[model samples]
Target: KPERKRVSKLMAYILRHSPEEFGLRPDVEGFVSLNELVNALKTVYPEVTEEFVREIVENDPKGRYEIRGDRIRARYGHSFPVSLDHEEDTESRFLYHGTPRRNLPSILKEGLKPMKRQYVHVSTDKIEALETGRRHGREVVLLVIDAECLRKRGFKIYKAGKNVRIVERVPPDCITLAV
Candidate 1:
């Protein structure tokens, strides 16, 4: 049971951070052999099996891990460079981002920045964005982004797991507060 949590964390790290650190080499698209990932985890959890790894990936509520054929990849949250597929226009759907109240003015002044993550994460669901901001505090604010604006600005938006989208950066002019 304890190994479940640790192995899951390591998989997220190696797949999203540094696969080479665990001798797991990822392809240009950031996909590594599922078996390879399973074997790599064997170092930490000797009892780990491919099925165990599959269980971890499939059960992940966030859909962090994606399996294709015999390979697997982390859907988003990459520290290194990985040009994942993008749906140039995921149908003109507006996106929303949640931020703390205190950070609003500066966000408007500086534009939305990917402080830690690779890109600014936004969601099609307003409440979904709010939930993320709520992770920090109740004094959170929601900002709506016009999908057309980002495309017009030449920003490529990529999907994270499902409803969530990722973009390189967002200019303040493209955002408007939503309650």
Candidate 2:
């Protein structure tokens, strides 16, 4: 729904804003881990806590938000799926507990195969993907890529076919998407 967690919103801002915006450096990575970020925020806000920030970042990296930039100026914000399923449970076609290192990308690729054949509307949103995977106790969340974003990143979309695909194996490949 529109009521996304406050930490999620803040993380998005932190991801996007320059360190100078917060009185930091322009060359610094500003890669605020959930723990450190929350601690800093709690010190200032006094109402927030580490658990609060953890719930948001670890909850869904690609689901409710996105991290942009390749290195120095990477930004984070509300992703497309976040905007699309504002009031709906969008997790429907992902594996939630499957090892991302060796499992997720293939599952996504396989799921997309069927869609590629039937031209079905394969669930691309993170929530739906998590919902689908979690139903089977799998550990993998699907991340839908935006065509425009990918294009901007130098990847061309083959519009002639399915035009989209899912990727897998992420950082800490063992952490749960929602748990």
Candidate 3:
């Protein structure tokens, strides 16, 4: 059971960020062969099996990974450049992003940009956003985003996972500090 946690981190590292770290390459859509994944992980986890990997994929609370036929890839939160082909026309009126209070002034001035990862992560609700902000610092500020306005203006928005949304960027006009 504990091993699953370790395995999940490894999965996130490889599938979401650097497949090349394991001598594996994900396709443009981010799918890597399942066989290659198991082999890559075996150096550290000798007993890691396909079933165990599948269990993490199926049971992870965040629904981080997706398995299709003989392939597997992280559903979202990638640091590397990989274009996920997921598209849904559903429109969202509002979204939320959580961050430290210290960053609020700059964000309010320049808008939210992906500092490290490929896209700015947003959440559908304040609670989810709060949790995300808490990961960064002590004082968290929730920012409400006018997602519908952004969409109407031609920016693309994507559903990253069950609780996350992704946007290439968020300009200052579309965001306001949550009250």
Candidate 4:
């Protein structure tokens, strides 16, 4: 279990944040050759192999990475830029974003912004938001998003993965503190 967890963090670092640091190149869509990924990881994790990588990808709790044939890529949480060819203008009635108490006031005033990643990551439910918030800090706040209203008002939202939703930006007018 520890090995798998370790490999998963390495994969997240390489696939989601910095492939170049590991000498792997993701294509325009953020996919890298699986063989190259395995080879690169084997340097840090001497026991790393394609099968192990596949296991991690197949069993990742967050559904972070996708493996297709000889390629693999992170589904979201990309700090580096990549044009995700996702369906534009998809509608979600209400999405939730989790934040620590430290940022709640600022976010409530100015709305959610994608500080580092390409898009503002949100969850489809409060539980998912709570889980995400716990990772940042002990005290968490949930932001209820009027995604349908935003979409109707000429904004865009997309389903990034099973539980993750993303938007370009969310103005204060489109967000409220979840009670």
Candidate 5:
């Protein structure tokens, strides 16, 4: 096992040299780990060991060497916080039979289908990009940013107007819940 001081230094080295150095946007989040760091370094050096890097990070005196759950973070840095006091609880309430939430089929079945152009990544790729590896994967259409941004860009209005024209001249339902 690597000593704490060595592990800490290795972690610092990774923070300084790895993708984080280039400000590579993490598809997930946060600094890359030493194991991942070593693996990436291997492309050039090919002789790095898990133990060699582990010791440097494990031994860091500055709280820069820290672990939260399975994720590693610099002590003073940011983390995606565990939501203990949620503004909305995902658990079901009394009225809904304690029922789990379910995805409604896309409400854009009618004239609103044209608004698909405004959805995130959908225009660029479509269902193939969004599909999970599983056969039953479902694609979720998303606005490029938030609904407000989409509305400002005239996407939501187009959908609503089309639906109103096609439906009983009422408004389209765009109800959504956040958790």
Candidate 6:
């Protein structure tokens, strides 16, 4: 069980972080050659056979990984930049970005960037919004995104998952500090 957990973290590290650090060149879409990933894992974990990787990815409760015919990629939560392909969300009324109050000043002027993650992770519900922002000693801030206005202007949003939405970038006018 311990080995399974450890190998899974390694797989997540390889997929979400820089795979180049693992001696594999992920494509722009973040898909890595399955065989290469497996062999790379084998270099570290004997427990990490191809089948083991597949099973962990398949059984991930969060639907974190997707395995294509000959490749695999994390569904979301990528720190290494990659072109994410998801259905355009045109109907969402609003989205919420959670951040520490420390970020509000910079965010108000420049708007939200992906930071390290490939996309700006946001939520439809307030509870989930709180999850991302509530950290450390400072106050948490929730920035409300005007999704419909954003869509009308030009920028597009994508459905990251059932509950989360992502955008390329948000302009300052399209956001408000939640009261």
The candidate that achieves the highest TM-score relative to the unseen native structure: 6
TM for candidate 5 is 0.30
Model 2 residue 31 distance off true place after TM-score fit, in angstroms: 1.3
Question: How big is the positional error of residue 130 in model 1, measured in Å on the Cα after superposition?
Answer: 0.6
Tens digit per residue, CA lDDT, model 6, 1-179: 67777887888888988777678766545688899999989888865778888898888888888899989887778874455675677778988978788777898999887554445667788768877678532588888988987787787777665677767678888998874
Model 6: pairs clashing at backbone N, Cα or C within 3 Å: none
The TM-scores, one per candidate, come to 0.58, 0.28, 0.58, 0.56, 0.30, 0.59
By TM-score rank, best first, the candidates go 6, 3, 1, 4, 5, 2
Candidate 2 yields a Cα-based lDDT of 0.36
The global C-alpha lDDT for each of the candidates, from Candidate 1 onward, is 0.80, 0.36, 0.82, 0.80, 0.32, 0.77
Count of clashing pairs, candidate 6: 0
lDDT per residue for candidate 2 within 1-179, as digits (tens), equals 23335545555554455332443222212243444454545544667765554444445646543223322222324121111211222222332222233455564444332211112122434555456556555455444434334333443222111212222222232123333
Q: Model 4 residue 3 lDDT? A: 99
How does residue 175 of candidate 1 score in lDDT? 92
How would you encode candidate 5's per-residue C-alpha lDDT over 47-159 as one tens digit per residue? 66666554544655564644444344344333221111112222211100010122224332221232211111111122232231123234333322123333334442211
By lDDT, is 3 or 4 better?
Answer: 3
After superposing candidate 4 on the true structure, give the runs of residues whose Cα lies further than 4 Å from its correct spot: 1-15, 19-84, 88-91
Residue pairs clashing in model 1 are none
Q: Please give, for residues 1-179, the per-residue lDDT of candidate 3 as tens digits.
A: 79999988998899988887788877646789999999998988999999989888999999899999999999888875555885542667889988798888898898988654445778887898999799889789889999887787787877655657777789988988874
The local distance difference test score of model 1 is: 0.80
User: Cα miss at 32, model 2 (Å)?
Assistant: 2.7
After superposing candidate 5 on the true structure, give the runs of residues whose Cα lies further than 4 Å from its correct spot: 1-34, 43-47, 68-71, 76-179
lDDT of 1 by residue, 1-179 (tens): 67778888898898999887787756546688988888898887799999988888888888888998899999889876554664444584699989899888898898788654345678889989999899987788999898889888888777655577778788987898877
Compute the lDDT of residue 58 as modeled in candidate 3: 90
Error of 5 at 98 (Å): 42
Q: Backbone collision count in every prediction?
A: 0, 21, 0, 0, 20, 0
